From a paper:
MLK3, also known as MAP3K11, is a serine/threonine protein kinase involved in regulating the JNK, p38, and ERK pathways. It is composed of several modules: an SH3 domain, a kinase domain, tandem leucine zippers, a Cdc42/Rac interactive binding (CRIB) motif, several linker regions, and a proline-rich C-terminal tail. The SH3 domain has been implicated in the autoinhibition of the kinase domain through an intramolecular interaction via a nonconsensus single proline motif located between the leucine zipper and CRIB motif in the full-length MLK3 protein.
In this study, we also mapped the location of the canonical binding site on MLK3 SH3 by solving a structure of the SH3 domain of MLK3 bound to the NS5A-derived peptide (APPIPPPR). The crystals diffracted to 1.5 Å with an Rwork/Rfree of 18.8%/22.8%. Alignment of both complexes shows that the two binding sites are on the opposite faces of the SH3 domain. Interestingly, Asp-80 and Trp-83 of the MLK3 SH3 domain participate in binding both peptides; however, in the case of Trp-83, the side chain is implicated in interactions with the NS5A peptide, whereas its backbone carbonyl interacts with MIP. The Asp-80 side chain is the only one involved in both interactions; it is oriented differently depending on which peptide is bound and interacts with arginine residues present in both peptides. Finally, the shift in the n-Src loop required for MIP binding likely interferes with the binding of NS5A, further explaining the competition between the two peptides.
Author numbering:
A (entry chain B), B (entry chain A): 44 to 113
The structure:
């Protein structure tokens, strides 16, 4: 299972992670005790680690599906 | 109501539309009569119109969500 950013997000604080549409986001914690806020998760995109709004990602992506026949 | 590509799709036919993950895809028809094959939809990306595998897109996109409070 992977998560994919479905929207761009621009940090309004230094501990926040920028998201761009289509980014694969590695979800490192869903626990508010770590993100510091309900509805914020901790993740990584490329080399960057920070918190991001959980409603900006969708569980989806990974291996591309086999396309239907033509 | 927006559709987003969740995976990259490399065309393998002259009427096929390339997708890149995170692209918004304007869906012009879901009808196989139009696409010419079940599970292939017709759409527009980047000014080009062609067909793509319907299993590469997800309904979602539109406006970025309201982020939760910190």
């Amino acid at each position: 299972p992977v998560w994919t950013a479905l929207f761009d997000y621009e940090p309004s604080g230094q501990d926040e992670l920028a998201l761009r549409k289509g980014d694969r986001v590695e979800v490192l914690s869903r626990d508010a005790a770590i993100s510091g806020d309900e509805g914020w998760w901790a993740g990584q995109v490329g080399g960057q680690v920070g918190i991001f709004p959980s409603n900006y990602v969708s569980r989806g992506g990974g291996a591309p599906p086999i396309p239907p026949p033509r």
